[PDB]
Each structure stands twice: as structure tokens, then as C-alpha cells.
Design an enzyme around this catalytic site. Structure first.
Site, PDB file in Angstrom:
ATOM      1  N   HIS A 160       2.408   5.144   9.086  1.00 47.30           N
ATOM      2  CA  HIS A 160       1.396   4.158   8.745  1.00 47.30           C
ATOM      3  C   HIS A 160       0.484   3.873   9.932  1.00 47.30           C
ATOM      4  O   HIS A 160       0.880   3.996  11.093  1.00 47.30           O
ATOM      5  CB  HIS A 160       2.041   2.858   8.261  1.00 47.30           C
ATOM      6  N   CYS A 189       0.827  -1.205   0.000  1.00 50.48           N
ATOM      7  CA  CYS A 189       0.000   0.000   0.000  1.00 50.48           C
ATOM      8  C   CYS A 189       0.863   1.257   0.000  1.00 50.48           C
ATOM      9  O   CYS A 189       0.487   2.280  -0.585  1.00 50.48           O
ATOM     10  CB  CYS A 189      -0.941  -0.009   1.205  1.00 50.48           C
TER      11      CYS A 189
HETATM   12  N1  LIG Z   1      -3.726  -2.352   5.370  1.00 48.99           N
HETATM   13  C1  LIG Z   1      -3.196  -3.573   5.338  1.00 48.99           C
HETATM   14  O1  LIG Z   1      -3.382  -4.381   6.233  1.00 48.99           O
HETATM   15  C2  LIG Z   1      -2.365  -3.968   4.153  1.00 48.99           C
HETATM   16  C3  LIG Z   1      -2.133  -3.061   3.127  1.00 48.99           C
HETATM   17  C4  LIG Z   1      -1.368  -3.462   2.040  1.00 48.99           C
HETATM   18  C5  LIG Z   1      -0.855  -4.752   2.007  1.00 48.99           C
HETATM   19  N2  LIG Z   1      -1.087  -5.606   3.013  1.00 48.99           N
HETATM   20  C6  LIG Z   1      -0.545  -6.962   2.939  1.00 48.99           C
HETATM   21  O2  LIG Z   1      -1.602  -7.821   2.506  1.00 48.99           O
HETATM   22  C7  LIG Z   1      -1.843  -8.877   3.437  1.00 48.99           C
HETATM   23  C8  LIG Z   1      -3.258  -8.739   3.985  1.00 48.99           C
HETATM   24  O3  LIG Z   1      -3.201  -8.891   5.400  1.00 48.99           O
HETATM   25  P1  LIG Z   1      -4.446  -8.564   6.364  1.00 48.99           P
HETATM   26  O4  LIG Z   1      -4.536  -7.069   6.547  1.00 48.99           O
HETATM   27  O5  LIG Z   1      -5.644  -9.347   5.881  1.00 48.99           O
HETATM   28  O6  LIG Z   1      -3.919  -9.219   7.733  1.00 48.99           O
HETATM   29  P2  LIG Z   1      -4.932  -9.884   8.789  1.00 48.99           P
HETATM   30  O7  LIG Z   1      -4.231  -9.985  10.123  1.00 48.99           O
HETATM   31  O8  LIG Z   1      -6.264  -9.181   8.689  1.00 48.99           O
HETATM   32  O9  LIG Z   1      -5.078 -11.372   8.190  1.00 48.99           O
HETATM   33  C9  LIG Z   1      -5.410 -12.471   9.036  1.00 48.99           C
HETATM   34  C10 LIG Z   1      -6.270 -13.464   8.264  1.00 48.99           C
HETATM   35  O10 LIG Z   1      -5.468 -14.381   7.514  1.00 48.99           O
HETATM   36  C11 LIG Z   1      -6.106 -15.662   7.499  1.00 48.99           C
HETATM   37  N3  LIG Z   1      -5.117 -16.774   7.469  1.00 48.99           N
HETATM   38  C12 LIG Z   1      -3.982 -16.846   8.189  1.00 48.99           C
HETATM   39  N4  LIG Z   1      -3.307 -17.996   7.925  1.00 48.99           N
HETATM   40  C13 LIG Z   1      -4.024 -18.691   7.025  1.00 48.99           C
HETATM   41  C14 LIG Z   1      -3.884 -19.979   6.307  1.00 48.99           C
HETATM   42  N5  LIG Z   1      -2.816 -20.783   6.519  1.00 48.99           N
HETATM   43  N6  LIG Z   1      -4.859 -20.326   5.439  1.00 48.99           N
HETATM   44  C15 LIG Z   1      -5.925 -19.535   5.218  1.00 48.99           C
HETATM   45  N7  LIG Z   1      -6.112 -18.352   5.829  1.00 48.99           N
HETATM   46  C16 LIG Z   1      -5.215 -17.879   6.726  1.00 48.99           C
HETATM   47  C17 LIG Z   1      -6.955 -15.737   8.757  1.00 48.99           C
HETATM   48  O11 LIG Z   1      -8.233 -16.299   8.450  1.00 48.99           O
HETATM   49  C18 LIG Z   1      -7.119 -14.299   9.210  1.00 48.99           C
HETATM   50  O12 LIG Z   1      -8.490 -13.902   9.122  1.00 48.99           O
HETATM   51  C19 LIG Z   1      -0.833  -8.730   4.561  1.00 48.99           C
HETATM   52  O13 LIG Z   1       0.107  -9.804   4.519  1.00 48.99           O
HETATM   53  C20 LIG Z   1      -0.100  -7.433   4.311  1.00 48.99           C
HETATM   54  O14 LIG Z   1       1.312  -7.669   4.316  1.00 48.99           O
HETATM   55  C21 LIG Z   1      -1.825  -5.246   4.072  1.00 48.99           C
END
Ligand SMILES: NC(=O)c1ccc[n+]([C@@H]2O[C@H](COP(=O)([O-])OP(=O)(O)OC[C@H]3O[C@@H](n4cnc5c(N)ncnc54)[C@H](O)[C@@H]3O)[C@@H](O)[C@H]2O)c1
Ligand SMILES: NC(=O)c1ccc[n+]([C@@H]2O[C@H](COP(=O)([O-])OP(=O)(O)OC[C@H]3O[C@@H](n4cnc5c(N)ncnc54)[C@H](O)[C@@H]3O)[C@@H](O)[C@H]2O)c1
Ligand SMILES: NC(=O)c1ccc[n+]([C@@H]2O[C@H](COP(=O)([O-])OP(=O)(O)OC[C@H]3O[C@@H](n4cnc5c(N)ncnc54)[C@H](O)[C@@H]3O)[C@@H](O)[C@H]2O)c1
Lengths: 72, 342, 336, 336, 335
Positions: C180, C153
Site C-alpha cells: 500500500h 480500499c
Molecule cells: N487512501 C486513503 O487514505 C484511504 C483509502 C480507503 C479508506 N480510507 C479510510 O477513510 C478515511 C479517510 O481518511 P483520510 O485519507 O481523509 O485521512 P486524512 O489524514 O486525510 O484526514 C484528516 C482530516 O480529518 C479531519 N478531521 C479530523 N478530526 C476531525 C473532527 N473531530 N471533526 C471534523 N473533522 C476532522 C481533518 O480536517 C483533516 O483534514 C480514513 O480513516 C481511512 O481509514 C482511507
């Protein structure tokens, strides 16, 4: 590990008793050299894990609360 | 379009910290492959993959005991299979590589590895076979003197319970005749060769903490300009300590001069002593030229990053990262000229 | 009419469902969800969200396997190991990998082993994974690649206005800082974590962290390799993140010229990707802004004559979730 | 020994008394307080601070016009207009302006006409006011000047580690942004305010604000005139704040050498003013820090060969309050 | 000189050690710490804490298996399975159970199965387990019990000012609602969790959660079986919480007599456990309070003549840890 090093080095010492200079000695010493280097890398990896167990735990489980590393 | 690099070694397959510097120079990090055999000697990085020449072994550990051959002996290795896989890896074809586990000693089911961005072959016979020698885009071999090697054996490998002091001298004396004829004459083929010797400043104590190291670089190699000290072609003895730089015992000494290395023309770089702190580490790197560095202090940053690793302050690692940056500059020029022809 | 799946039903996965639902004329039909919590949670946390509010849709479960949104049925299968997922049974075409661990070629390929035609990674891909950001190198995409990564992001916000700075002005070297919002990786109270900085409580602290965002802009623009580096500051705000980037340009310029260069670039080549705000605004104002990067006109200033500081607001979840939908639309546009 | 009064019992005013209380053989003896709140609030809020915790001292009102702090009695008066204040009667030699209202020489000179010898203010003065920073400019103070200023919480943190970079390396031009904690001027919830970005809720927003700190350090170091610029970013943390500075130096250098220069200068001549932090840390770990600036060694980072980024931590309430004590000790030492 | 060790180095684990460090003369000696944490990881979390501030000691690692704390060295074992832990090898007498995943007799027995002589559960135990609160149920303890459970954070607060209320006024019925601070149980942002209320963002909003602490007081005060029940509300504050009890007392009384009872009870019977506060404070001022409950005197109201509403504060991290330290002293003195 070190017990098999001790067995190899005892037998390598005994194998050189029959021959002062022969190709059986260089065979026995080559093994002992390889076993000692093998024990050294096992020693290093055991020490490396003891300081940071979590990175080895995060190797198998990256979704747990201790292991998540999201960027941005 | 991959690049082949050859490095000969005696102590171990990846045991030398030489590889840790090179991967970090041209990659974020290097790690063993995910899954598969836990004893796989292969290392995988983003751009680098290390290849163990011990894996291309014709006989298991059980087999060599019933023969006269040592691990360093040419008959124990089969170059016929090694050259086939490397040539396939060179063009970009997938390969099946056997694994020589150092613990068990039995040839395991072959592992497959994909063509890398940069290929290095660690082992003991990279340049021994003439066919593979052509495939190599760069040839490295570090010579460890028997006095400092025996010193390194005692300081690190004596702590094992089974070994005795005189038993260790009985090991390298048996390894000497096979190593001298089959491993040592590879120095002529090597594009760059590093010697390590006991220091002449201190009264010749053989602990190996502060050693004397020469860097011998072949001149005339394409995409390779040797590092020089204050003047290319001349003979210089420089001691950096003085009015502006003050440092403690033992001290630091340098020697840049041309030489003839087995009918070749080379320029040598000698360093004798160790680095007490950061101030003389920049002072030394600042005055060197043709470093193939992206920015100021890149050599110092890579050494301070890997300072806890053994030999990171005595000049061994200093020439290892200097050679490591040279492979990168060799790499980027070569792929650019290949791309114009491509 | 592409059958798209969602493997990570986290913060981004739920926004992707909210972003796909709000869109009209999208070639994506979401039929599969993989949350480890199960159908009961995925029905609930999608319906009510703390940062986005209640979903304006009749979200209710339909059996112990699927959920129904506004009449449309979406399947919920819970399996940690992705290789055992019935992707071939459903016949899903794309996988929106939002979990955040399977960022390598070997891990994400387990979806391909399950019958997925393609996988989009919401994280910046580890290794030689092709990284495409919408608005910069979007046309570089070809159908040949099975696994693609949409970048961070920060990078999704950094790349567009850096593209404007590099081309019109000419950039030499730049340093970036991003303030952030806190994310799911940080612990709520102090407890063990791989990073000691992240381990501290997110709600009470300014947590510095390591990001590869400025180094990742080199992937989308080859000119900038070795020219940028950056840090991140994780402040106790949940959703809105701001990034400031100070560069050394080649063309001597002043402050308002940089702003005027971001206005014509907005209307001409980045419409819907980049915007400029001329009013005194704070973080909460930029909630649910589809623009991946929103410049703050008042705060940009150039010291000397060739050192330019420009700061920009962006939504980390929603603004980036939309770009994933745009990227998947590009994937659906070029099929076979 | 020196009769000193406090005008304005704010966060700086409360932190001043507790920092002075912990000192040993400090020449100052606090005799008066001027807060419009009254004795019941000043006595209570001194004992119970939400940010600094309770006071490890006995605090009870003495009579009804004064409070008794650890046996010592301190007269407390309440008045908006400083001309009516009884500095003649109490014979106060040093009056401290913690209100933040009287920063002009015309307005803050009312204490002199009330009977005060010398007034030092806690904010950057307006007009011609001598501004000093302890460890940078405090060694060029003349007693004849009766109105002085200790520069702002950021400016007091900037100048020491900025002085080292100019002396050792030499700066061409630089910029900064300070991810500041929130303060009293911001509104808790959205309500009318002349500066609209401060009107917004400080607990939920990242408030960006123009600052004079980067421009004020030019008053402290004359050769840095017209070379630094900066803006502030206020995030929802109570006490601790960070500042990052990017400068284009002349001498080519890299990251670790700058830290070695900071560590050596921190021990040589900025002892007790600058400290270098080598551990991965976080804001609350710098609560009640006695150094004006604590550099974070992990985040120091250079690009190219001459662009240097440096992140520093400061306690705006406490660490600045310590320097006001140390500056007041400086005045009392050559007080003649 | 009783050899004790910690099984969970979280909030209650770290607060226990720093509460033990503050004691002037204690019979406890800590030797080992079990946690999913490295040596540099556990030491850094001990020294620097976002809630209580920096630990005033000299904390550094001694080797790759132990840390140095004010000159004393403690080993840091790291194994999530308790049955594979080296307790007999170090000579442990009791183990502090702070993980929160071993609160049953089957699970918590993996320590004594591995070489422990006793364990102290820092949670309300599941099933038939001894539940003890310092100052109320401290006497009814014998060396016979191998596993003992100190009650929850708000139970160690609710029992003291009820025991005096029940004995001097008589409690017919009552309810309770504690506005609790968020813990490591909840999630930072909305994430997967089995409790649909706790699954939502903790720092943003109020979260109602059920509590068993109102029922759990019948374990220490059997005179209240089936007369108290209540809920809890998680609020976005880091550490300290407050409780609100409204009971229908039997004997007719007014408001000032209620505060008079707590003042007299605190001076003799509950000295060190209960305290009364008369000044207008807020939450942050009760940090690191050693009293399990500080009654707010000016908030005690009475409606009619027999309904009493009382409000009292407590540091769930620090005050409850001190009760574990105080209860661990009771184990040592009865060894
Ligand atoms: N604002 C942001 O959070 C953001 C912005 C840009 C990029 N990202 C990237 O994109 C990704 C999105 O992360 P997020 O914000 O959803 O984090 P999060 O903590 O919300 O994600 C947790 C989720 O991942 C799932 N999960 C974990 N292990 C799993 C497995 N083995 N199989 C299936 N499901 C599984 C779980 O169900 C849980 O609900 C992140 O890795 C981050 O690096 C995040
Ligand atoms: N953010 C910081 O913490 C910080 C740090 C360093 C310097 N400063 C500078 O410090 C000054 C004080 O900051 P602060 O937040 O402590 O102030 P504050 O907002 O806490 O001050 C309010 C105090 O001033 C009293 N006061 C206000 N007007 C008054 C008047 N006319 N007469 C008498 N008393 C009056 C108020 O009742 C209250 O006691 C500001 O000048 C600020 O720029 C602030
Ligand atoms: N706040 C209170 O005083 C309170 C209230 C109710 C209950 N409790 C009890 O204490 C626990 C709460 O502690 P917290 O949430 O503040 O600490 P926490 O959850 O923040 O930390 C617990 C630590 O234990 C470690 N751990 C977890 N599982 C483990 C295992 N299987 N083996 C070894 N180590 C493990 C984790 O790494 C973690 O760092 C509850 O689960 C309950 O048992 C405490």
C-alpha cells in the site's frame, strides 16, 4: 482508597470485639471484602495506564498525530 | 434471538480472567461502554456484553450495614427485577439497568443497554433463582477451594496496607456459612463446573502457582459434547512426559474418567501441574478430542495471546478457553436450528 | 436533488468533491463541508493537490463561511464535535463521514442527532455496522439502515475479483498481501505513535502494518468467513497501492484461464468496477483509474494446479472515492 | 594469503571490500580491482558510500595505478575485456565477477584464459553452473569445479528458512513475492530499456519484475524442484528489502509453532545465517545485517491447517556481500 | 554532576541523549524524560532511528516508569502540562525544552514554576530572551538568566562563518537562502495546516518557508542589525541541509582569500565549530557531523570584487544537538 480500606478494616475489627459470633460481624467483614476487591481493580487500572498513557490519551483525542490509525 | 449464559463467581465482578478469554474467543475485544458512569460494571464487545449481578442489588452499601444480610445473601439481591430485564433482553427489548458502584456503594442512575449477540451474567446467583435458570442456555460455575482461595487472597490481596495475615482468615471464615448454603449448592445446576485444588505432585505448597484442576461437564446437554481423552466413557491416567516430550519439574498429569455428580452423569477431565513451554502445550491440546476448534492449535493461540494474564500456564486458563470454545459451538448450532424454525 | 454533506475534508473528502464535480447526472448536491482548518485552507487544498494536480474549476472563497466552486456555493463550518453542527438548518440528507474516527455506531449517530437522514462511513465500520461494497452486495442495501459503511480500499479492490474467483473456480483458503501507499496516519519523521511500526518515517521505510481487509471480505461475502487473512506493506509511494492475493482453489486450473475468467466477468457483470491490463505497467500509470480493481495479466501464475496467485493494481484514494459516490448514488436512488 | 581480485566495482564490489575489511584473519588478500570508472572514482566512491556512509579507514591513491586502504596497497586496472586483464602477472587465484555482465560459462571463463585459477560470480549463472548457498548447499563443494555462483540476494535469503520448512514440515508447493529495493538496472527517469517496466522511474514507481530466485533455489535443494514460483516487486527504497513466502505444507501446524521451529533452527545449525526478530520493526533497522534472513515473528501467519505465510528481511547489498566473503573463505579453506 | 532532564523526546530530544552518550567525560546527568510517550514507546524510538541508525547501547525498560540505557536508568514521566511535572521531586537543575510549543517566557516558566532552576529552549525564543550560539555568543552568559535560547538550526550554522567574515572583510549587506530538509513541521500528504505552503506534501516537492534565522544573527552579532535577511526552501531529504550566503563585503578580495580565511579561522578560533571541506561531497556524507558548518571550498565564488557567495552544510539534527550539549556544558561550568 487504601486509607478508607484501613478505616473500614479497623472498625470491622472493633465491631467484632463486641460480638464473637453475630450478624454484625458478617456485615462488617462483607464490606471489608468488597473494599479490598475495589482497591484491587483500581490498582490494576492505575498500573495498566502507566505503561501506555497514549492509548488513554488517544481515547479522548484520536485526530492528533500520535493517535491516527487508518487502515489501508 | 440473543443467547443467555450464566457464570457464578466469588472473587469479583469481572475480576476473574475467565471473561477476558471468552470475549476474545468470540470477539475482537471487550471494553466498558463509552461515556456514562465511569464505575459501570458492564462490559461491551462486538458480540458479547457482560452483565454484573451486583448491579441488581436491593440495598445500597449504606443500607446493608443496618441489616444482617451479606452481599451473598439472597435478600440483598432482588431477583424480581433481574428476571424482568433479562427476559426483555432475551427477546430483544431495550432495558434500564441500575449500577452498583463498588467504590461509592450507592445505587447510581440506571444505565440503558441494548440487546447483545451473546449475553453473559457474571455474579453470584445466576442459577439460584429457578425462573432465571430456565432462561440460561448454558450454566457455568467455577469452584475455588478454600485452601487455594485463601492462597489467592494472600498472594494478591495481602499487599494492601490495612490487611493482616490472620485478618484475612477471619474474613473467609465469616463468609463461609452464608456462602456454603446459598452459593455452593448451585454446582448441580451448572452445565460445566471447574474445581481448583492444590497439586499432589509437589509437597502441597499453598502458593497457588501450580494447582490441581478438574473439569466436570454434564453429559446429555443439547449442543454440547464433552471433551474426552483418547476414549469416550473409559478411565485414563496419562502422563505426557517421556521419550518424545521431555519437560522439567513439577511435571504434567491427566485423568479422564466418568463420574456421578449429584445424581447426574458427567465425565471429568483432570490436569495437575503446569506448562513449562510451548512444546507440551501443543502436545496436550493435540491429543484431546471434541475440542470444537476451527483449526489446529486454536486453544494454544488463545492461551499464548493471553499468557501474561494470571493462571495462563497452570491449567485454569486452559479449561477456561476450552469451555469458551464450547460456548461458541453451542452458540452456532443453536442459532442455526433457531433460524430453521424462525 | 439530495443535499449531501462532507464531514471529513481530508484526502478522501477532497477526492469526493473532485469525483462528484466531474460526474454528470448525479443526484447529489454538496452544500456543506466540515474542515477543522477553516475556509481558507479548504479553498486552497481543493484547488491545488500534489497527487491529482490543479482543479479545473474557479475555486475561490465567498465570505468567511462558504466557498464557491464554478459558481456553486458550498458552506464551510468548523466544529470538532459533530453534534453541534447545523445539519438540520441546512437540511442535509446524507453525511459523507470521511474523518476516520467516528467509525462506531455511537460516534456516527451524533450526525443523526444533528438532523442527518443518513451517514456513509468511508472507513470499515466498527461493530455491527452494515458494510456495503459497490459491485458485490450493492443490491443488499435497504433504506431502513441509518448508518452504512463502505469498506476499505483494499477490500473494495479485494472483494470484486474474489467474487469472480469464489464463484467460477471455488476457493478453499487464501492468504493476501497488499503493498500500500503511505497514508496520513504515518509520521513523516520518527516520533511517538500508538503503533510502533507506523511511528517510523513513512518516506524512507517499508512499514508493515495490521489490516482487517481480508477478514472484512467475509462481511461482503458470507462464504469466505474464516478463509482469509492478510498483512499490508506501506511503501514510499504516495498514491498508488497494489495488492496480491494467493488462494487455494477447488477446481484445477492454469494461469491464462484465470485471466480469461476476469475478462468475461469484466464485460458482463463488473463493467466499470474491474478491469484487466495486458501491458507492462507500473504504479504511476494507474493514477485516477475509476476501476476499483485492475488486474495485471502478465504477473498472475498458478503453482501446482490449485494454488492461484493473482495481483492487481488500484488507486487507494481516487478509485475508492468514486465507489463512495456510486454508493451514495445507490442511496439517492432508493429514497423513502 | 590467497590472492583475490575483483572484476566490477559496483554496489556488490564496494560492499565486498568493506565486508572483507572488517573480517578477522580472513585468508583472502585483495590485490586487484577491475572497474571501467578509473582510480579517482574507485578511490572516492569506496571512501564515500551514500548508502553505507563513509569508510572508517584511510583511503588515498598510491601512485596513479593503485589505491592505499589502511596501509594496504591495492592495484586498480580498468578494462572491459577480461582476456586482456593481467591475472597472469598478478597471479590471481580467485577472481570475483561483480560486473553482472559475464554470467555465462563461456563469457565468465575469460578470466581463466586470462590466467585466473577460479572465478566466482555474484549472479545466478546461465547454463550449467554450480550454484551454492552458504548454510544450505555450501557443504557440498568440490574444488575441481573452477566456476561457481553465489545465488541472488533473494535466493540467498530464501534457501535457509525454506530448508527448515521442508526438513521439519515438508512442503507440497509454494509461491513468493519479494518487495525488493530498487537497484542499478532501473532507469532513474523514463528512457529506453528492453524491459519496459525497468524503463520507468524507480524513485516514483512500484516496479514489478520477473525473478529467477524462486526457480533458482531448486538448484540448491533438489527435492524442491518444480515446486516454487515467484515474482518481484521493486519499491522506492535504497537498500533493504523484504520477501514473503506462502507454501502449502503437509504436516498440520499453526503460526507460533513455525516461529519456534525457526528460533530453534536459528540457534542450532543456522547460527549467524538466520535470526528471528520479535520486535515491531522496519527496513532501515535491518541496514547492514549480517544474517542472510531475519524472520519477522509478528507477521508469520497460517490459514486453514497447512498453508503457511512467512515474511523475511534481507540486506540485498550488504548481507549478500557477507555470504560472498564466507563462500570465498570456504573455497580457500579446502583450496588444494 | 548536574541534574538535567528533557521535556521533549522528539528528534532534538533523542539526538541530545545520544550526543550526551558519546561524550567521554561530561558533567551532565539525565534522570527524567517528559514526553507524550510510553516506556516501550520512548525506548524503541531511542534504540532504532530511521535517520542515524541503531543506537549502540543496551536499551531496555526497567519497570513501567523508567528505561535502562547502558546500565543507567532514567524515569519517563508523561504529562503534557509542564506546571504539573515532578521536577522538584527528582531534583532537576535545568530542563531541555524540545516540545516547540513553549518558547515564550510565560510558557517556558511553567518548569521553574514546577521546580526547575533553569531551562534551555531549543528554538528562537519569542520576545525578550537570551539568544546564544556556541563559539560566537558563548562568552556573554551569566548565571542570572533563568531561561536561555539556543538559536535555530541554520542560525548556529550562519553565525560562525559570518562572524569571521564580518570581522575580516566587513559585511555591508547580504541575503541568504538555505535549502532545508523536511522536518516534523510539514505534512506527509496534503492535510490541514495553517501555513498553506507547509500544508502540502513534504516528501514530494520543494516548499518555500520563511525563516527568522537571518534576522536572529543580529542577536548574537549586534554589528549586523538590519543587514541580513533571507528565506528557506524545504526539499525532500530526511536530515541534512545546506546554506547559501551571498554578502556584499566592503574590502576588495578574491575567492581563494575567502577560503583561506575560513581555513585559518577553523584552526584556532572556531576549532570544533567550523570546518572547511575540499572534496566533492553530497548531503548524506555530512551526517552526524559535529561541526555546525562545513564550508564547501570549491563552491565559493566571487562576483566583481566585493560580492562573495559561500555554501556550507550542517546536520540540523545532530550538529545543533551537539551545540545544545556544548551550551549545556557552559551552564554547568558557570553554576
Ligand atoms: N487512501 C486513503 O487514505 C484511504 C483509502 C480507503 C479508506 N480510507 C479510510 O477513510 C478515511 C479517510 O481518511 P483520510 O485519507 O481523509 O485521512 P486524512 O489524514 O486525510 O484526514 C484528516 C482530516 O480529518 C479531519 N478531521 C479530523 N478530526 C476531525 C473532527 N473531530 N471533526 C471534523 N473533522 C476532522 C481533518 O480536517 C483533516 O483534514 C480514513 O480513516 C481511512 O481509514 C482511507
Ligand atoms: N540489488 C543488489 O544490490 C544486488 C544484490 C545481490 C546481487 N546482485 C547482483 O549483483 C550484481 C552487481 O550488482 P550491482 O548493482 O552491484 O552492479 P552495479 O550496477 O553497481 O555495477 C556497475 C558496476 O559495474 C561496473 N561494470 C559494469 N560493466 C562492466 C564491465 N564490462 N567491465 C567492468 N566493469 C563493469 C560498472 O562501471 C560499475 O562499477 C548484479 O549481478 C546483481 O544481480 C545485486
Ligand atoms: N531541527 C532543528 O534542530 C530545529 C530547528 C528549529 C527549531 N527547533 C526546535 O525543536 C522543535 C523541533 O523538534 P522536532 O520537530 O524535530 O521534534 P518532534 O516534533 O518530531 O518531536 C517533539 C516531541 O515532543 C513531544 N511533545 C509535543 N508537545 C508536547 C507537550 N506539550 N508536552 C510534552 N511533550 C510534548 C511530542 O510527543 C514529540 O514526540 C521545534 O518546535 C523548535 O522548538 C529545532
Amino acid at each position: 482508597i487504601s486509607d478508607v480500606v484501613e478505616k473500614s478494616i479497623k472498625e470491622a475489627q472493633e465491631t467484632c470485639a463486641g460480638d464473637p459470633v453475630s450478624g454484625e460481624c458478617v456485615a462488617a467483614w462483607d464490606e471489608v471484602e468488597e473494599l479490598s476487591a475495589a482497591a484491587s481493580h483500581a490498582r490494576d487500572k492505575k498500573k495498566a495506564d502507566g505503561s501506555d498513557p497514549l492509548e488513554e490519551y488517544c481515547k479522548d483525542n484520536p485526530e492528533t498525530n500520535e493517535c491516527r490509525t487508518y487502515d489501508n | 434471538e440473543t443467547i443467555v449464559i450464566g457464570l457464578a463467581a466469588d472473587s469479583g465482578c469481572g475480576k476473574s480472567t475467565f471473561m477476558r478469554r471468552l470475549t476474545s474467543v468470540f470477539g475482537g475485544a471487550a471494553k466498558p461502554p463509552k461515556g456514562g458512569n465511569p464505575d459501570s460494571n458492564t462490559l461491551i464487545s462486538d458480540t458479547t456484553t457482560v452483565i454484573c449481578l451486583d448491579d441488581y442489588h436491593s440495598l445500597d452499601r449504606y443500607g446493608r450495614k443496618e441489616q444482617k444480610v451479606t452481599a451473598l445473601d439472597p435478600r440483598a439481591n432482588d431477583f424480581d427485577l433481574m428476571y424482568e430485564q433479562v427476559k426483555a433482553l432475551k427477546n430483544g427489548i431495550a432495558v434500564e439497568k441500575p449500577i452498583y458502584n463498588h467504590v461509592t456503594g450507592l445505587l447510581d442512575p440506571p444505565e440503558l443497554i441494548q440487546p447483545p449477540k451473546i449475553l453473559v451474567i457474571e455474579g453470584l446467583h445466576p442459577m439460584f433463582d429457578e425462573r432465571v435458570r430456565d432462561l440460561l442456555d448454558f450454566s457455568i460455575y467455577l469452584d475455588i477451594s478454600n485452601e487455594v482461595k485463601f492462597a489467592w487472597k494472600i498472594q494478591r490481596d495481602m499487599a494492601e496496607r490495612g490487611h493482616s495475615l490472620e485478618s484475612i482468615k477471619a474474613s473467609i471464615e465469616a463468609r463461609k456459612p452464608d456462602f456454603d448454603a446459598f452459593i455452593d449448592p448451585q454446582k448441580q445446576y451448572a452445565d460445566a463446573v471447574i474445581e481448583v485444588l492444590p497439586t499432589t505432585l509437589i509437597p502441597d505448597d499453598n502458593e497457588g502457582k501450580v494447582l490441581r484442576v478438574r473439569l466436570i461437564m454434564k453429559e446429555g446437554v443439547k449442543y454440547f459434547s464433552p471433551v474426552y481423552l483418547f476414549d469416550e466413557g473409559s478411565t485414563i491416567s496419562w502422563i505426557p512426559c517421556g521419550r518424545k516430550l521431555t519437560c522439567s519439574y513439577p511435571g504434567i498429569k491427566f485423568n479422564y474418567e466418568p463420574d456421578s455428580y449429584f445424581d447426574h452423569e458427567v465425565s471429568v477431565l483432570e490436569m495437575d501441574g503446569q506448562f513449562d513451554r510451548l512444546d507440551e502445550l501443543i502436545y496436550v491440546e493435540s491429543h484431546l478430542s471434541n475440542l470444537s476448534t476451527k483449526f489446529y492449535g486454536e486453544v494454544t493461540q488463545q492461551m499464548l495471546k493471553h499468557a501474561d494474564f494470571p493462571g495462563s500456564n497452570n491449567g485454569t486458563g486452559l479449561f477456561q478457553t476450552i469451555v469458551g470454545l464450547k460456548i461458541r459451538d453451542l452458540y452456532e448450532q443453536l442459532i442455526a436450528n433457531k433460524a430453521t424454525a424462525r | 436533488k439530495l443535499k449531501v454533506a462532507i464531514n471529513g475534508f481530508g484526502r478522501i473528502g477532497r477526492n469526493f468533491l473532485r469525483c462528484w464535480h466531474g460526474r454528470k447526472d448525479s443526484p447529489l448536491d454538496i452544500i456543506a463541508i466540515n474542515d477543522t482548518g477553516g475556509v481558507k485552507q479548504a479553498s486552497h487544498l481543493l484547488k491545488y493537490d500534489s497527487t491529482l494536480g490543479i482543479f479545473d474549476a474557479d475555486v475561490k472563497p465567498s465570505g468567511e463561511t462558504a466557498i464557491s466552486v464554478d459558481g456553486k456555493i458550498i458552506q464551510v463550518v468548523s466544529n470538532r464535535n459533530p453534534s453541534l453542527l447545523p445539519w438540520k438548518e441546512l437540511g442535509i440528507d446524507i453525511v459523507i463521514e470521511g474523518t476516520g474516527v467516528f467509525v462506531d455506531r455511537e460516534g456516527a449517530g451524533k450526525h443523526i442527532e444533528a438532523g442527518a437522514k443518513k451517514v456513509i462511513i468511508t472507513a470499515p465500520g466498527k461493530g455491527d455496522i452494515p458494510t456495503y461494497v459497490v459491485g458485490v452486495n450493492a443490491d443488499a442495501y435497504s433504506h431502513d439502515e441509518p448508518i452504512i459503511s463502505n469498506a476499505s480500499c483494499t477490500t473494495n479492490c479485494l472483494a470484486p475479483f474474489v467474487k469472480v474467483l469464489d464463484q467460477k473456480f471455488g476457493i478453499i483458503k487464501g492468504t493476501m498481501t497488499t503493498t500500500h501507499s503511505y497514508t496520513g496516519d504515518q509520521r513523516l519523521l520518527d516520533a511517538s505513535h500508538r503503533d510502533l511500526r507506523r511511528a517510523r518515517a513513512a518516506a524512507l521505510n517499508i512499514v508493515p502494518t495490521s489490516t482487517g481487509a481480508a477478514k472484512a471480505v467475509a462481511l461482503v461475502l458470507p462464504n469466505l468467513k474464516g478463509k482469509l487473512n492478510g498483512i499490508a506493506l506501506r511503501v514510499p509511494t504516495p498514491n498508488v497501492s497494489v495488492v496480491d492475493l494467493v488462494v487455494q482453489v477447488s477446481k484445477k486450473t492454469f494461469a491464462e484461464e484465470v485471466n480469461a475468467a476476469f475478462r468475461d466477468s469484466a464485460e458482463k457483470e463488473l463493467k466499470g468496477i474491474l478491469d484487466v491490463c495486458d501491458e507492462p505497467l507500473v504504479s504511476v500509470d494507474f493514477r485516477c483509474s475509476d476501476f476499483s480493481t485492475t488486474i495485471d495479466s502478465s504477473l498472475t501464475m498458478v503453482m501446482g494446479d490449485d494454488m492461484v496467485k493473482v495481483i492487481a493494481w488500484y488507486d487507494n484514494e481516487w478509485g475508492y472515492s468514486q465507489r463512495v459516490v456510486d454508493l451514495a448514488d445507490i442511496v439517492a436512488n432508493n429514497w423513502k
